[PDB]
Amino acid sequence: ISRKWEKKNKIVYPPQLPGEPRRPAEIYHCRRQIKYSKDKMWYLAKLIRGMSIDQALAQLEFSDKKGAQIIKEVLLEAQDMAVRDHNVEFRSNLYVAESTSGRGQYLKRIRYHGRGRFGIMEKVFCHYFVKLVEGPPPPREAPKTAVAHAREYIQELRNRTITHAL
């Protein structure tokens, strides 16, 4: 096994000199050995990337997946750590910077078919990792406009040089 996500909260940075930009907070939290599957949990994790914590909880409130309740508990208990263990005021000023799902330890069983045959059954366990960063959510990138495509294409035609020239 490997447990490195838990130890990321023990990193102590040197004090900041006056005049430097304020360092946004970073909270690392995870849950181990969830009965939910790895692939099924991924779709929920992909859903809440880049959204603020309040709207992330709203989306998972009404989701019918069994993992929706599990993730909501993780975010709520991670928010309490941010406001108490860390000096993060404005408990609504957090956004989910990164969320992902890993695989745990599986239990192997025997699944019967018939004719004396069998198949190995894998009990599935998965982990959930979430990182909360203080601040408003970053703005999502818009698709490239017509001018942007034209600018890149003209620039590409201007980088051309005589191949195998001299």
């Binding site: 023990k10 990193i11 102590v12 940075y13 040197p14 004090p15 900041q16 304020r22 360092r23 907070a25 970073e26 860390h86 000096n87 005021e89 404005f90 408990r91 330890q105 239990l107 192997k108 069983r109 025997i110 190995i120």
Partner: protein, 246 residues
């Protein structure tokens, strides 16, 4: 197929295992404070007077009967103990103990502070960064009272000395992310404390160790914190209605 999981951690305690310790636990210092000194409410204004403050404190030392018996008890248990020289040793211990927290050195702090004092000054600042300095001492420290207790179970005698110190300190606590949390660096705030020391007399070594820190009930409130807090409201179950106390 018959493979299962192990390693479920739980903490269970029973009376039977605690009573079956072959070697009883040895305590270097007592848990609580035997008697809490009650300073008069006028100390905030007497401290600005030199002759009145020193003379009044000196009388309190020479007039208490229980305190004088405790002083004699220390002398009989261990010679070459002087009340006059104690505050200078107590003052240096106080400065050295806090400078250990600044450097986050726990090995030295164990010798300076006692077992009942170590968790209080370490637990909260474990992951933080503090910067503490000493600049001035407006009033020299005075010994308030000395008490002793005789535990007949083992014959152990602990001598507690209460010292009142008027100290000028510069405290600044930094967050683990490097941002300022509690106080500035260049402001020499004036602070007053009643530090209680403790020494084990039966122990041939018996280092003088700081035991506790007593704050007067009428002490001015501490400087406000920079971070804004919110007290949550009472969590309400659906079948319970909110009631407003007045």
């Amino acid at each position: 197929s018959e493979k299962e999981f192990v390693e479920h951690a739980r903490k269970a305690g029973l009376v039977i295992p605690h009573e079956r310790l072959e070697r009883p636990i040895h305590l270097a210092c007592t848990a609580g404070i035997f008697d809490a000194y009650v300073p008069p409410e006028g100390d905030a204004r007497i401290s600005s007077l030199s002759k009145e403050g020193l003379a009044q404190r000196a009388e309190r030392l020479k007039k208490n009967v229980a305190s004088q018996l405790s002083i004699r008890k220390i002398r009989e248990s261990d010679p070459n103990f002087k009340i006059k020289d104690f505050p200078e040793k107590a003052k240096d211990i106080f400065i050295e103990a806090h400078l250990c927290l600044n450097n986050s050195d726990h090995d030295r702090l164990h010798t300076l502070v006692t077992e009942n004092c170590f968790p209080d000054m370490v637990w909260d600042i474990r992951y933080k960064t503090v910067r503490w300095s000493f600049v001035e001492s407006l009033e020299p420290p005075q010994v308030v009272q000395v008490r002793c207790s005789s535990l007949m179970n083992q014959g152990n005698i602990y001598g507690q000395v209460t010292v009142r110190m008027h100290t000028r300190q510069t405290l600044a606590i930094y967050d683990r992310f490097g941002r300022l949390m509690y106080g500035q660096e260049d402001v020499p705030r004036d602070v007053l404390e009643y530090v209680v020391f403790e020494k084990h007399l039966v122990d041939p070594y018996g280092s003088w160790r700081m035991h506790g820190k007593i704050i007067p009930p009428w002490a001015p409130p501490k400087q406000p914190i920079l971070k804004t807090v919110m007290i949550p409201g009472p969590q309400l179950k659906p079948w319970e209605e909110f009631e407003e106390p007045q």
